[PDB]
Amino acid sequence: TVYTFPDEFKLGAATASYQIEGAWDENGKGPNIWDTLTHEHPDYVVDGATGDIADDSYHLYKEDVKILKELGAQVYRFSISWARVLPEGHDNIVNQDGIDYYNNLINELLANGIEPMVTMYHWDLPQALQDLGGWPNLVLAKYSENYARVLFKNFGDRVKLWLTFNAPLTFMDGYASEIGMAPSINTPGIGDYLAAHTVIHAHARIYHLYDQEFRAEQGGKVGISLNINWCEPATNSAEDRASCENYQQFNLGLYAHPIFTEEGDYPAVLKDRVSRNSADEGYTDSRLPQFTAEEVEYIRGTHDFLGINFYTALLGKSGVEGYEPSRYRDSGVILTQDAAWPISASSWLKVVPWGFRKELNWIKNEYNNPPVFITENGFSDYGGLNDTGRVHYYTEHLKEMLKAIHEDGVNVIGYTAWSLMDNFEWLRGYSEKFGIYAVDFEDPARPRIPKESAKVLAEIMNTRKIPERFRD
Ligand SMILES: OC[C@H]1O[C@@H](O)[C@H](O)[C@@H](O)[C@@H]1O
Ligand SMILES: [Cl-]
Ligand SMILES: [Cl-]
Ligand code: NA
Known about the structure:
- The structure is a monomer.
- By secondary structure, the protein is of the alpha/beta class.
- It has a single domain (1-472), classed as Glycosidases (TIM Barrel, Alpha-Beta Barrel), CATH 3.20.20.80.
- The chain has helices spanning 17-20, 33-40, 57-71, 82-85, 96-111, 127-130, 140-155, 168-171, 191-218, 238-260, 268-280, 293-299, 327-331, 353-367, 388-406, 452-463, and strands at 10-14, 75-79, 115-121, 161-166, 221-227, 230-233, 306-309, 313-317, 334-336, 372-376, 412-418, 437-439, 448-450.
- Helix 15 (388-406) links the parallel strand 10 and strand 11 (412-418).
- The longest helix is centred in the middle third of the chain and has 28 residues, at 191-218.
- One chloride ion is lined by residues 468-469.
- The PDB classes it as hydrolase.
- Keywords: cellulases, glycosyl hydrolase, hydrolase.
């Protein structure tokens, strides 16, 4: 039983637009902040890589569907490129080529018995909107509503699973470093909080839009994908436990407390620690933006499920470190990783499968057991088809998730592996491989070929259980 997937549980794989599509300026697509970063600042990216071609999924989407069908995916999670649909960011011009592209992909999936799950925003903001300040500027919440309306109108007759945003905890950091994630602006502890605030408002507008304009007709579900690491106390002390609770609230709770609790608003510890630190540094006003009571009520409850991107764990101990001002410093935890944990090709990603079960329980307890869809989970290496590390990563994480479901009563409803194929890994370029299919980026045809992990995942998807040879 503990090794079998529930009958209705959905298994599949995931990608994101900039990471796979290419065709960055083809057929009317406008520029986004990742076009800008990779073109203007190749020094920020391993190898000076760009997403100009990537997996060429703009042209090769039928090949993506073919490998999804081979894998036996029930669901394909992909994102829509805002600037491919609305090249100016604003909704005055809709690019028919972009509409056609996503319709073609959706229709191809459905014809092959694969359900589309669509992320509206996976980090590729139109440059025209960044030029207004991007996410720190609250005007983007209405712009995001208008973008979502175009998506619901054009695609919602066939798409029944939506994510407003992907991993805003990560993309907000594009406002916390001059050399980091797009748009690479150095406003740590100030602009990243403003970005989060706008994202939360935008998410809520999109959910209410669905309720008002689309749900009765379309009957789908709208969630948000939040990334979160487990944070294990470095020792069993109450002080180290407090630091790990701080971590959860400053990383997951920042987004999930406003949306997924009955109370709404930011977590108290976030409000209070930032208020205190801001006062002590001489600011008249807290660096953390505020919601009014009306906004708190508007935002809370704006969910049909919770998407989670889970990869790894950290150790947390009591204390404060980091630069003033910064979210890490504000969070009141000292973070490390255990040298004993298996490594990957990504400095931040260690293999800690039991952390997944701990995180799922933390979520269950904090948010009253929301339906949870694992929208990403996966592992990096530098190359190779005999990807034993990736196979082990998947089989262990899936076992831990199944324990969370069967032993712990966590309402996990689906899981999409990150990623269907090797792709553009942001500032790491093509150097870090997350795919279950390999892609030859030196071959203009970008063939996708299965790794051992794709074969094992296909076996899991076909049999709906963890094979005996991977059991404890
Ligand atoms: O870093 C690995 C992956 O983690 C995620 O949380 C992001 O959504 C992906 O775009 C990224 O490729
Ligand atoms: Cl101890
Ligand atoms: Cl066997
Ligand atoms: Na339209």
